[PDB]
Amino acid sequence: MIQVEENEHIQTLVYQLNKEGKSICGDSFFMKADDKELICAVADGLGSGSLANESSAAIKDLVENYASEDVESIIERCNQAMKNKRGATASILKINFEQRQFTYCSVGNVRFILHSPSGESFYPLPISGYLSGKPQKYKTHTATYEKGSKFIIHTDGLNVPDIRSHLKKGQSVEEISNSLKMYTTSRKDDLTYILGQLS
């Protein structure tokens, strides 16, 4: 499944495909852009079956409902919802277009890379553990992006040797998605990513 969106400030693409032979996806995402801001999130539930989905879906729902809150507030609501669930790894990104500012918070192995035309990339290491409902010490990143920046948020189903290179070379989110096609054919795990290109 691919879904694309565009406005004056960003173009996005969401790709999601299940593990080969698996009916219920354990990954979830949420994406919403208006003329002023973007909210998005990607999550990968622990365990299997309906229980992995229950966990990542709870995140999708909370990010949509609480989108106006700061990322660390949203992720903490997500953490509380994991109590008595399998838990999930997750990443939450908010962008304010007028300021060209983004904020980011994550726990676990859902990765985020933002590539600047200047050749700088924001590429945090994964934070160990997962959202389990137990106490977290969140790390929130706040920074300015330059026009022309491109980014990806992806679950562990996408395993690419040099993701930065794909972002640098691609001229649109459709091109970057096509550039990643060889990593999507095996379907060893659920695979979810969100691409963005920022004006």
Contacts to Mg ion by CB under 5 A: 44, 155-157, 189
Shortest Cβ 142–Mg ion spacing (Å): 28
- For Mg ion, the closer CB: 37 or 44: 44
Q: Nearer Cβ to Mg ion, position 21 or 135?
A: 21
Query: Measured from the CB of residue 3, what is the shortest distance to Mg ion in angstroms?
Result: 20
CA torsion, points 117, 71, 125, 167, in degrees to nearest 10?
A: -30
Q: Which residue is listed with tokens 């698996």?
A: 22
- Confirm if 159 and 183 have CB atoms less than 8 A apart: yes
- Shortest reach from residue 146's CB to Mg ion, in Å: 31
Sequence-ordered alpha helix ranges (H) in the chain: 49-65, 71-81, 163-169, 173-179
Beta carbon of residue 51, minimum distance to Mg ion (angstroms, whole number): 14
Cβ closer to Mg ion: 95 or 110? Answer: 110
| Closer residue to Mg ion, CB minimum distance, 49 or 117 | 49
∠ at Cα 163 (27, 38), nearest 5°?
55
